[PDB]
Structure formats: structure tokens, C-alpha cells
Amino acid sequence: SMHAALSTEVVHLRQRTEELLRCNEQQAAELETCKEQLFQSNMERKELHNTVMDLRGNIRVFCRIRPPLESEENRMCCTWTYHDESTVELQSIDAQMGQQIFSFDQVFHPLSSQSDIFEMVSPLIQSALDGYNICIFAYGQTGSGKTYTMDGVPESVGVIPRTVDLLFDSIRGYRNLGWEYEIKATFLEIKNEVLYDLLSNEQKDMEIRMAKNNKNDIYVSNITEETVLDPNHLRHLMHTAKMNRASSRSHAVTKLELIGRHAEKQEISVGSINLVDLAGSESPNRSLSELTNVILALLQKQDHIPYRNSKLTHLLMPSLGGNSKTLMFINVSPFQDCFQESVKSLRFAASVNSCKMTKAKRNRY
Amino acid sequence: MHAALSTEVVHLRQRTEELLRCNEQQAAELETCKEQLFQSNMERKELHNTVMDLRGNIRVFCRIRPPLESEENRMCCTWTYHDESTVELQSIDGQQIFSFDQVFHPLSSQSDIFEMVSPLIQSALDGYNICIFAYGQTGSGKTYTMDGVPESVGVIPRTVDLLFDSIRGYRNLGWEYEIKATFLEIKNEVLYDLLSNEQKDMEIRMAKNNKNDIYVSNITEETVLDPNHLRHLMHTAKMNRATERSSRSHAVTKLELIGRHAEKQEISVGSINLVDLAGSESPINRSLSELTNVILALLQKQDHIPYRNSKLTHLLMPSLGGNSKTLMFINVSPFQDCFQESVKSLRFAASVNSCK
Ligand SMILES: Nc1ncnc2c1ncn2[C@@H]1O[C@H](COP(=O)(O)OP(=O)(O)O)[C@@H](O)[C@H]1O
Numbered sequence: 040s041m042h043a044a045l046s047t048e049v050v051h052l053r054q055r056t057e058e059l060l061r062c063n064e065q066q067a068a069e070l071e072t073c074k075e076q077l078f079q080s081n082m083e084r085k086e087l088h089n090t091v092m093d094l095r096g097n098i099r100v101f102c103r104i105r106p107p108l109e110s111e112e113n114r115m116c117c118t119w120t121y122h123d124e125s126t127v128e129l130q131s132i133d134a135q136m137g138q139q140i141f142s143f144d145q146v147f148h149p150l151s152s153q154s155d156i157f158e159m160v161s162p163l164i165q166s167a168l169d170g171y172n173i174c175i176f177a178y179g180q181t182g183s184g185k186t187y188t189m190d191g192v193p194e195s196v197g198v199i200p201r202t203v204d205l206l207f208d209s210i211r212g213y214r215n216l217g218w219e220y221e222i223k224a225t226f227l228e229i230k231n232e233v234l235y236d237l238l239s240n241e242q243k244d245m246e247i248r249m250a251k252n253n254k255n256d257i258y259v260s261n262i263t264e265e266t267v268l269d270p271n272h273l274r275h276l277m278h279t280a281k282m283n284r285a286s287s288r289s290h291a292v293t294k295l296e297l298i299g300r301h302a303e304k305q306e307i308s309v310g311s312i313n314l315v316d317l318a319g320s321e322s323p324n325r326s327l328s329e330l331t332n333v334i335l336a337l338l339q340k341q342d343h344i345p346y347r348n349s350k351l352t353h354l355l356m357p358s359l360g361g362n363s364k365t366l367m368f369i370n371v372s373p374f375q376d377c378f379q380e381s382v383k384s385l386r387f388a389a390s391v392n393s394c395k396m397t398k399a400k401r402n403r404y
Numbered sequence: 405m406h407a408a409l410s411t412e413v414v415h416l417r418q419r420t421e422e423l424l425r426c427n428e429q430q431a432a433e434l435e436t437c438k439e440q441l442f443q444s445n446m447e448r449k450e451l452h453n454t455v456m457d458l459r460g461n462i463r464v465f466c467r468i469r470p471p472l473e474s475e476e477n478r479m480c481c482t483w484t485y486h487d488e489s490t491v492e493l494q495s496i497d498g499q500q501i502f503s504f505d506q507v508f509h510p511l512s513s514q515s516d517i518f519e520m521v522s523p524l525i526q527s528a529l530d531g532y533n534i535c536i537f538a539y540g541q542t543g544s545g546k547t548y549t550m551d552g553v554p555e556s557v558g559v560i561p562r563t564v565d566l567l568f569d570s571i572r573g574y575r576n577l578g579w580e581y582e583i584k585a586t587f588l589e590i591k592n593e594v595l596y597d598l599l600s601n602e603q604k605d606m607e608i609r610m611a612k613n614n615k616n617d618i619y620v621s622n623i624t625e626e627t628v629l630d631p632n633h634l635r636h637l638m639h640t641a642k643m644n645r646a647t648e649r650s651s652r653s654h655a656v657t658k659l660e661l662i663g664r665h666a667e668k669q670e671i672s673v674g675s676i677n678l679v680d681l682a683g684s685e686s687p688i689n690r691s692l693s694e695l696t697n698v699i700l701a702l703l704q705k706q707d708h709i710p711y712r713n714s715k716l717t718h719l720l721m722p723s724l725g726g727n728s729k730t731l732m733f734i735n736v737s738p739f740q741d742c743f744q745e746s747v748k749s750l751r752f753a754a755s756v757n758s759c760k
């Protein structure tokens with residue numbers, strides 16, 4: 040009577056046990072399959088993203104909105120409506136005709152980690168090894184993330200360090216192929232329309248001039264041509280330069296010139312990686328005033344283009360023209376007090392988004 | 405023993421609490437992670453079409469065949485490749501220079517030609533219609549180009565294989581696709597089922613739920629069971645052919661893809677249309693000339709397009725629309741007797757670029 044009752048219940052529960060374990064097994068089998076498919080999908084989606092951006096041409100504009108830090112709680116924060124992964128719109132908390140919705144190549148949410156940011160940039164660096172000039176720029180008001188995105192903090196490294204390792208990994212496989220790539224370095228700081236070499240602590244006078252090789256590229260003199268040795272050597276040179284830099288509103292122009300040496304045949308790759316940390320979008324515009332003019336130039340002007348008025352724009356004269364992938368980070372603060380400046384940064388980003396197609400060279404001489 | 409089974413029950417009730425909490429956790433990981441797989445694959449599909457758009461929706465290609473050793477003694481003409489997109493023939497006795505989206509010389513393998521088509525099979529799975537053509541004089545390679553040969557299969561066999569392998573993959577995204585094939589043929593502006601041995605009349609009407617879609621009556625529409633099926637089917641398609649006289653007959657294969665996601669209650673339907681155009685030689689005189697009026701017409705963005713003027717332009721109409729992608733292979737004989745006709749072919753290809 041009792042011994043009957045409870046021995047049935049035992050069996051009944053053995054049924055929920057093996058059912059809740061059967062369903063528990065297949066859930067994990069689907070779940071493992073779903074994530075891989077989701078990775079594979081994200082892979083083929085970022086592939087086509089690079090593949091589309093490529094055909095549109097050679098100027099890319101990414102927009103990264105910074106999250107309020109632990110110091111911003113009651114600070115007024117403008118409304119932010121993310122319509123797509125490439126289209127975003129900001130709204131003034133107060134009252135309100137103008138452009139408020141903005142579409143770029145890729146818009147990064149505050150949540151996006153430094154890894155995701157560099158994940159989209161990675162293809163360009165890799166392209167520099169196959170003979171290609173690359174230039175990365177960080178525009179925006181101060182506090183928006185220009186240092187955070189371009190460079191990186193200790194915990195989350197930025198684009199600058201992330202490329203270092205990525206570049207040496209590729210170099211490793213290329214040495215094996217017989218391609219002995221050589222990495223060089225050039226760190227300089229146009230603080231106030233004056234170049235100041237960050238690798239050379241001794242004061243010098245850089246002078247930007249039509250690169251003697253060809254009118255197409257434009258080199259610079261009095262600059263420490265430091266031949267990089269390994270990932271951490273460059274991490275040493277990174278530290279070196281930030282030391283000299285110390286800054287808030289200055290153009291830190293880094294030029295990791297990338298050469299190649301193939302044992303199969305005397306060919307040489309060209310990798311003009313140009314990681315530039317602009318600063319000061321808000322109105323004081325020392326060199327950044329002419330940056331908006333070369334940009335508005337490439338939109339209107341064709342062959343004719345202002346090349347001076349900004350040491351920065353004269354260094355970048357290889358890019359503006361052609362054979363150079365240009366990518367600009369639009370770091371923008373999410374606060375209502377900076378709502379107008381944020382719009383200003385997004386207006387410049389829209390003109391950058393509307394810039395002309397630049398060609399590309401095999402750069403394999 | 406009563407205390408023994410009184411304990412087991414108490415163990416079994418825990419291990420089923422934890423197993424109930426464990427299954428509750430898994431299912432919410434699956435829920436959002438299928439949401440992501442869907443949204444991710446959805447931005448994927450969007451990008452792919454944009455890529456496909458930049459490359460062009462209507463691309464034109466050129467494939468001069470290698471001279472057969474049967475004809476090693478038949479004399480060639482002077483072919484000059486000005487780039488990989490451009491070509492020019494000259495008569496061995498004004499200039500004749502032609503530009504393409506891509507040109508295929510006589511060592512271009514069958515695989516090199518499918519590489520142009522391969523991306524489209526993904527767009528047929530994405531719900532866009534797709535159109536594939538083998539324009540050229542008889543002996544150009546039209547048949548060799550699409551159907552292929554046993555050692556090196558053509559575009560149609562490569563499609564099938566890629567089609568099934570995608571479908572198997574897709575099934576992990578939750579879509580379940582189905583393939584319905586209509587092997588038919590147009591002669592003297594009248595259609596014929598190739599899968600049927602009896603002779604039944606067929607006509608082009610509107611589809612039950614779409615006026616733009618095309619419906620053919622009393623055709624066969626075999627639903628494909630596995631490649632083995634698709635093999636038998638395609639075999640049986642070569643039958644009921646004969647008048648040997650495929651020179652004046654348009655061989656239309658149409659693999660309709662019918663993808664349905666139950667979870668999200670969403671459908672994807674794309675139609676592939678691999679057409680083996682009849683010989684372009686001046687003695688179907690209607691369907692051929694018409695199909696090329698329409699294609700030009702499309703390029704020039706005319707308001708109205710005489711889709712009904714031809715059985716072929718009528719039958720293919722839902723795959724000639726803007727969102728729909730079309731690839732045109734001009735096969736050409738590299739010989740001196742073929743010269744004049746090979747020019748006509750290429751000249752039409754100039755027409756296309758000119759209307760753009
Ligand atoms: N996505 C992010 N996640 C975490 N912290 C961020 C993010 N973006 C910016 N920050 C932080 O906010 C500040 C960004 O300002 P910063 O980049 O230093 O000024 P500037 O824009 O002049 O270089 C830094 O403290 C940086 O650590």
C-alpha cells in the first residue's frame with residue numbers, strides 16, 4: 040500500500056529525470072551549433088563589409104560614442120537613437136531644423152570594446168603588408184575617446200598597440216614564406232603648427248617636403264628613423280613618445296613605415312601605416328581648420344587641393360590624393376552639454392563620409 | 405525497504421530541480437542566440453546584395469572556346485587581349501574592339517566560369533531571382549558552358565552541388581528549403597516539357613498569389629529529393645530532346661528555391677534560370693532577338709518592356725526585374741570562317757556597355 044505508492048513515484052521521477060536530461064543534452068547540442076553558426080555568420084558579414092567599403096573606395100569613417108565614466112552620473116546626456124549598425128541619431132534633451140540622423144561606414148556603441156574597434160580596422164593593416172598605404176585618424180571633441188580609441192589604456196589597449204602585435208604575427212608567416220619584412224617607426228607631435236619629434240628627446244626641426252622619391256608621396260626631415268625590432272621594442276617606443284608628449288590638443292602623427300624583403304625575388308612591400316591622433320575639434324582649430332578645408336577640397340576641388348596651412352595636411356598629402364586607405368574615428372561624447380559640439384563632429388563626419396574615391400597602388404616595387 | 409525509496413525520491417526531486425533550472429538557463433541562451441543568428445544572417449544577406457549590386461546586376465562575359473583538335477587545321481583569327489576585360493578579333497585575309505565585365509580565354513577552366521556564378525547561388529537563396537545565359541553561335545560552347553562535360557562539369561551541375569551544400573548548412577540556421585525543377589524548351593515560339601513523353605499544351609499565366617510571378621500550365625515541376633534525384637531528373641531531361649536540332653531551341657532549366665523559416669514564420673523564394681540560348685547565327689528568330697531587345701531595354705530604363713512579345717521574354721520576366729541578377733556568357737568560336745558571326749556576337753556585347 041505504501042511500498043506501492045512510493046515505488047511508483049520513484050519510477051515517475053525516473054521519467055522526468057531522463058527526460059530533463061534528454062532535453063538537457065539536445066539543448067546544449069543546438070546551443071553549441073547556434074553559436075558557431077553565429078560566429079561564422081559574423082565572419083562572413085564583416086568580410087562583406089570590408090568587401091563593400093573597398094568598392095565604394097578608399098575613405099572610411101567610423102563613429103564611436105564613449106560611455107559616461109564613473110565620474111558622469113548626473114551629467115546631462117543627449118538622447119541617442121541607434122537606427123542601424125551604420126546609422127545613428129542624436130537629440131537634444133532640451134526643446135529641439137538640421138541634420139540629426141547620421142549614417143557612416145560603422146557606428147560603435149559605447150559598449151563596444153577596444154577589441155571590436157580594432158577588429159574592423161585589422162583588415163587595413165593586413166592590407167599594408169600586401170603593398171598598401173593606410174592612415175587612421177581620431178577626430179572629436181576633447182574627452183570623447185580620441186586617446187582611448189587611437190591609443191589605449193593599460194587594461195584595454197588601443198588600435199596603436201593592437202596593430203603592433205598583429206603586424207608582427209603576419210611578419211612571422213611572411214618570414215617563412217621568405218618575405219623578410221622590415222618595420223620602421225616615426226613618432227612626431229604637431230602641437231601648435233610645429234613638428235616636434237617624439238622618439239628624439241633632443242629638440243630638432245622637422246621640415247615636410249615632397250618625398251625626393253616622387254612628387255606623389257611627401258616625406259619629412261629631422262625625424263628619428265627608428266628600426267623596430269620586436270613587439271615590445273615598439274611598446275617601448277610607444278612609452279618613449281608619450282613621455283615627450285606630456286598633449287591634450289595636439290596632432291600625434293605616428294608613421295610605421297613597413298618594408299619587405301622576399302627571398303624568392305627582389306621585391307619590396309610598402310606599408311605606410313599612418314596612425315594619427317588629431318585633437319581639438321572644438322573651437323579654440325590650429326591645424327584642424329585646414330583639415331576641414333582639405334576634406335571640403337576633396338569634395339569640391341579635384342586635381343587642385345590645398346596642401347599646406349597645416350603641417351598635418353602636408354604630412355597627409357600622400358593620403359588625400361590616392362593610394363591610401365583613410366579611416367577616421369568620430370569619437371563623440373554622449374552628454375547634453377556637449378550636444379552641439381557632438382553634432383559638429385557628426386557634420387564633419389558626414390562630409391568625411393561624402394569624400395571622393397581614392398585609388399590604390401600595388402606598392403610592390 | 406521504505407526508507408530507501410523514501411530517500412531516492414528526495415534525491416530525484418533535487419536532481420530534477422537543478423536539471424529544471426539548468427534547462428531554463430539553456431533555453432534563454434538559445435532564444436537570444438537564435439535572435440542574433442537571425443539578425444546576423446540578416447545583415448549578411450543585405451551586405452551580399454550590395455556587393456552584388458556594385459559588381460552589377462546584369463554582367464556580360466566572353467568565353468572563346470579552345471580550338472578542338474578535330475579542327476587543329478581549321479584556321480584561327482588574330483585574337484588580342486588588351487586587358488582582362490577587353491578583347492578584339494581581326495580577320496586573317498575599322499577595328500573590332502570589345503569590352504566586357506570579364507573575358508575567358510581557351511584555358512579558362514570550367515571552374516573559372518562558375519566562380520562568376522557561385523556568388524549568385526547565395527542570392528537565389530536570399531530570395532532574388534537569377535538568370536544565366538549562353539548566347540553565341542552554334543559550336544561556340546553554349547552547351548559546353550552550362551551543362552558541361554563528364555570530366556569537367558558545367559555551370560548547371562556546379563550549381564546543384566553548391567545548392568545542396570548550402571541547404572544543408574542553412575538547415576542549422578533554421579530555414580528549410582525545397583527545390584522544384586522545370587526543364588523545358590522553346591521551339592518556334594511554343595514550349596515543351598522535356599520531363600514528359602506525352603505532348604500536352606503549356607502556357608504562361610500569372611501566379612496564384614502574384615501577378616508578376618509567372619505560372620506555366622501542365623508543365624512538370626518535380627520537387628527534388630536529393631542529388632541522386634537531381635541526377636536522374638537531369639538525365640531524363642536530355643531525353644525527349646533530339647530534333648540533334650538544338651540549334652534553334654532554347655533550353656530553360658529553372659531551379660526554384662523555397663526557403664521557409666518556421667520559427668520566425670518567414671519565407672525566402674528565389675528562382676534560378678539557366679538558359680542555353682539557341683545558336684545566334686542568322687539562318688527562335690523571335691525569342692532570341694526579343695530577349696536581347698528586352699535586356700538592352702532594361703539597361704536604358706524604359707518605362708515599358710515588351711515581356712509578352714516573346715515566349716522567352718515572357719517566361720523569364722520575373723527574373724529580368726531590377727532586384728534580379730542576370731549573367732550573360734557570350735561563347736565565341738576562335739575561327740576564321742566563324743569570324744563574321746563571332747563579331748555579331750561580340751557586337752551585341754558592345755551594345756550592352758553602350759546602353760550603360
Ligand atoms: N568605450 C569606452 N569605454 C571605456 N572608457 C572610455 C571609452 N571611451 C572613452 N573612455 C574614457 O573616457 C576618456 C576618453 O577621453 P580621452 O580619449 O582621454 O580624451 P581625448 O579625446 O582628448 O584623447 C578616457 O578616460 C577614456 O578612458
Ligand SMILES: Nc1ncnc2c1ncn2[C@@H]1O[C@H](COP(=O)(O)OP(=O)(O)O)[C@@H](O)[C@H]1O
Binds near residue numbers: 547548683
Ligand atoms: N572550353 C571548352 N573546352 C572544350 N570544348 C569546348 C569548350 N567550349 C566549347 N567547346 C565545344 O563546342 C561545343 C559546345 O557546344 P555548343 O555547340 O556551343 O552548344 P549548342 O549545342 O547549344 O549549340 C562542343 O563541341 C564542345 O566540345
